[PDB]
Amino acid sequence: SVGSSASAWTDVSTQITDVSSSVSSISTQTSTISRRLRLKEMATQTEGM
């Protein structure tokens, strides 16, 4: 985990960032760590529109 410790959200994406390449580090995790949050975290808990 890019972060304190293992925790699906952060890490599971931090690692199995399968499918993507042609640029820089960060972006790739960020990205794969994005996939989760978004389309996922929403169907759960958050604010505003």
Binding site: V2, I26, T30, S31, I33, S34, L37, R38, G48
Partner: protein, 49 residues
């Protein structure tokens, strides 16, 4: 500190007031994402600044 996971590409770090690009951390990011409330940034940096 607005940490913005610009999915696909990008990622910026502000200072909630007088906005300001500034070192973005895969780390500081890690956790603060994992277990805290997130926000579906309607408008993002680009439009904001």
């Amino acid at each position: 500190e607005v940490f913005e996971a610009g999915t696909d590409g990008r990622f910026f770090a502000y200072r909630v007031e007088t906005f300001d690009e500034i070192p973005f951390d895969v780390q500081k990011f890690a956790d603060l994402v994992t277990d805290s409330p997130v926000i579906s940034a309607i408008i993002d940096f680009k439009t904001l600044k």
